[PDB]
Design an enzyme around this catalytic site. Structure first.
Site, PDB file in Angstrom:
ATOM      1  N   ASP A  13      -6.357  -1.965   4.331  1.00  0.00           N
ATOM      2  CA  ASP A  13      -5.478  -2.301   5.442  1.00  0.00           C
ATOM      3  C   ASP A  13      -6.280  -2.615   6.696  1.00  0.00           C
ATOM      4  OD1 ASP A  13      -3.282  -1.864   3.784  1.00  0.00           O
ATOM      5  OD2 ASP A  13      -3.136   0.238   4.352  1.00  0.00           O
ATOM      6  N   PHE A  15      -1.886   2.105   6.381  1.00  0.00           N
ATOM      7  CA  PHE A  15      -2.316   3.500   6.422  1.00  0.00           C
ATOM      8  C   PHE A  15      -3.584   3.586   7.262  1.00  0.00           C
ATOM      9  CE2 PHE A  15       0.340   6.073   3.640  1.00  0.00           C
ATOM     10  CZ  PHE A  15       1.141   5.098   3.099  1.00  0.00           C
ATOM     11  N   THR A  40       0.831  -1.196   0.000  1.00  0.00           N
ATOM     12  CA  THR A  40       0.000   0.000   0.000  1.00  0.00           C
ATOM     13  C   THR A  40       0.867   1.247   0.000  1.00  0.00           C
ATOM     14  OG1 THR A  40      -1.699  -1.174   1.274  1.00  0.00           O
ATOM     15  CG2 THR A  40      -1.878   1.218   1.139  1.00  0.00           C
ATOM     16  N   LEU A  41       0.869   1.960  -1.124  1.00  0.00           N
ATOM     17  CA  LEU A  41       1.629   3.197  -1.222  1.00  0.00           C
ATOM     18  C   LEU A  41       0.906   4.381  -0.602  1.00  0.00           C
ATOM     19  CD1 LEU A  41       2.818   2.755  -4.903  1.00  0.00           C
ATOM     20  CD2 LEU A  41       3.969   2.024  -2.815  1.00  0.00           C
ATOM     21  N   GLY A  42      -0.404   4.293  -0.420  1.00  0.00           N
ATOM     22  CA  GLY A  42      -1.159   5.371   0.164  1.00  0.00           C
ATOM     23  C   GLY A  42      -2.632   5.047   0.251  1.00  0.00           C
TER      24      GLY A  42
END
Lengths: 239, 256
Positions: free
Chosen positions: B59, B109, B1-3
């Site tokens: 997430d 996140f 997960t980048l964001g």
């Protein structure tokens, strides 16, 4: 049988694992350890092995955690490996979750460690049997065997010529639950003496004794207190 | 997960005389687009523990599955009610997860609340655990649980973790946290706790663009974990100057 005791992955025509049985046989050669429990306390006593006149008696009971201790019978190297495993398990649980480990889960993991060594031909069973005394909401005594089994006891005794101790415990079992701490310690010492040979005597040097309880973290009994208890045992036996 | 892509807004948890009250609106936003309006953001871990999240839904779902399987293993090994894991245990587990992922620079996140009852002396709900049937949905009084027996804990993206009498995530950490630091008191009744939470949620609805007034309340009490019927919060403006027509203001200048 000569043909089936060579390796640990072969069953005899009777479905027996002779190598594991011999690992268990190693346990019967050790010194006697006894453990009893009241409603609050677990008392663990044991006979320390003195090699000769100039040798110090060997350690018999070890501390695993604040409210966990063990005694061993069998191969000391195996006992050391298992002791290190248990200590690291307790410490790592405290590190990860900031709480005491569940004694049942600890004993289950130790039993799994026992078992995993009996499934491959490149390994061997531990030649050591463990007695685990702990306080987790209550007193508990566990016995772990070389074949991967573990049982829970109200009183336990293993080691050489421990059947006399077992007889004494079976006679006095009904009294332990409501006993006080002093009475429980005296009973454990009396069972150890029952195991002991008449020629031998229980002295502060060859006797190990520990207590774990409600607000009583696992502690070895000091030499002076042990001397007092042994004097009490001798006096009341003289009657 | 980048964001974060699909996100949930703040959660509020507080202690009151009978246990834990936790509230979150049932909305997940795909940016400025309120794509999902009936999303569940509070999950039951066991009979005494709940988890709320603000941040990426993916997430949050990953963590929820981890906690579900942890609870199943606990239940498999359980022999007595004292063997069930506590909210403190789950909070430590989640904090360790977040710390390790920070060390790997592969974070979740999310901001997480782990709340519940840190005790087994108030009921026998864990004597026989039912996972697929909720007997709650036959009414006995609630038990006054001591504040020291309750647990609310916060974990953030960097693994920063702590506990308090009330925890907020997201935008709540400003509005609801100010109102709670002013007005929260010990041993509040259920109606008082709900009124305080409703005030906080109303302020959030007025001042936060990613919130809704479709609210989910969850109570962790001696009866266990109860999900209330989701309700629409009434939110009316607090001034008539808002409603005053613009044509009644002077036509010259900058009156907008």
């Amino acid at each position: 049988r000569n043909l089936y005791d060579t390796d640990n992955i072969i069953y005899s025509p009777e479905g027996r694992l002779y190598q594991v049985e011999y690992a268990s046989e190693a346990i019967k050669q050790g010194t006697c350890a006894v453990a009893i429990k009241s409603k609050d306390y677990v008392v663990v006593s044991g006979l320390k092995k003195c090699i000769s006149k100039l040798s110090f008696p060997q350690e018999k009971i070890f501390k695993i955690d604040d409210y966990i201790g063990i005694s061993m019978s069998g191969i000391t190297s195996d006992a050391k490996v298992l002791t290190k495993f248990m200590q690291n398990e307790c410490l790592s649980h405290k590190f990860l979750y900031n709480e005491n480990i569940n004694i049942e889960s600890l004993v289950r993991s130790v039993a799994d460690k026992y078992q995993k060594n009996t499934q491959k031909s490149s390994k061997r069973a531990f030649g050591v049997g463990l007695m685990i005394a702990a306080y987790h909401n209550e007193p508990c005594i566990f016995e772990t065997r070389p074949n991967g089994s573990y049982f829970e006891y109200d009183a336990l005794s293993f080691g050489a010529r421990s059947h006399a101790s077992k007889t004494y415990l079976e006679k006095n079992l009904h009294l332990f639950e409501e006993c006080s701490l002093e009475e429980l310690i005296l009973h454990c010492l009396k069972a150890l003496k029952c195991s002991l040979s008449s020629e031998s005597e229980l002295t502060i040097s060859n006797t190990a004794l520990a207590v774990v309880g409600k607000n009583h973290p696992w502690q070895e009994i000091s030499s002076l207190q042990l001397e007092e208890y042994l004097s009490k045992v001798k006096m009341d036996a003289e009657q | 997960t980048l964001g974060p892509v699909v996100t949930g807004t703040s959660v509020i948890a507080i202690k009151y005389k009978h246990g834990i009250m936790i509230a979150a609106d049932r909305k997940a936003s795909y940016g400025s687009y309120a794509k999902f309006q009936n999303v569940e953001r509070i999950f039951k871990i066991n009979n005494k523990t709940v988890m709320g999240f603000s941040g990426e839904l993916a997430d949050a779902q990953y963590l929820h599955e981890l906690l579900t399987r942890k609870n199943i293993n606990n239940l498999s090994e359980k022999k007595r009610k004292e063997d069930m894991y506590t909210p403190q245990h789950y909070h430590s587990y989640v904090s360790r997860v977040f710390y390790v992922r920070k060390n790997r620079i592969d974070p979740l996140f999310n901001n997480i609340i782990i709340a519940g009852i840190n005790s087994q002396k108030y009921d026998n709900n864990d004597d026989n655990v039912l996972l697929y049937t909720n007997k709650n949905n036959n009414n006995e009084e609630y038990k006054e649980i001591h504040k020291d027996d309750l647990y609310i804990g916060f974990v953030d993206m960097h693994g920063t973790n702590f506990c308090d009498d009330y925890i907020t995530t997201g935008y709540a950490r400003y509005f609801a946290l100010t109102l709670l630091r002013d007005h929260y008191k010990d041993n509040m009744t259920e109606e008082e706790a709900r009124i305080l939470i409703n005030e906080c949620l109303r302020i959030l609805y007025f001042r936060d663009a990613t919130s809704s007034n479709f609210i989910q309340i969850v109570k962790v009490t001696s009866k266990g974990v109860e999900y209330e019927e989701p309700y629409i919060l009434p939110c009316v403006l607090n001034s008539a100057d808002y409603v005053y027509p613009s044509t009644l203001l002077p036509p010259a200048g900058c009156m907008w």
